Amino acid sequence: SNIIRGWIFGTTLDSKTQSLLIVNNATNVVIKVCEFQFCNDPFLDVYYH
Amino acid sequence: NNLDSKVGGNYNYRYRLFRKSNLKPFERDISTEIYQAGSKPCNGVEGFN
C-alpha cells in the first residue's frame, strides 16, 4: 500500500551549503539540489486539504 | 578581455582564496562563511587572522 515516498541527502542540511531532495507521488519523481532549509522532523504526508 | 573586462575593473568575478582541505574532483563549494588563519576559534563574521 505504498506508505514509503522519498529520500533526502546532504552534508550540512542547514542552507550554508547545498543539499538534495528526492520525492515520489502517484508515478512521478523530482530531484532538486537547492540550499534547502529543513526542520527537526519534516516529511511529506497525504495533504488531503 | 574585449567583453569581460571593464575600465573600473570587472570585480563581479570572484574566487575562493582559503579552504580547510583541497576539494574533490568536480566539487562546487558555494559557502560564503568565514575561514580561520589564527589559532583562536572565530564566530559571527570577522576576526584578527
Place this chain on the structure above:
Amino acid sequence: IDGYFKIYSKHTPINLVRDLPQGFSALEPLVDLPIGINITRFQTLLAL
C-alpha cells in the same frame, strides 16, 4: 562517485513472515545525475 550520483533498483513478491528474505537477485541501474555535492547524511520519507 567523483561528480556523479546514481541509483539502482529491483522489486519481488514474497511470503516470508517478518524479515528481509533469503534467495538471490541483483539490482539494475535506473538513473544517474551530476549533483557534484558533498554528502555525509541522509533520511527517508513516508506518508500517514
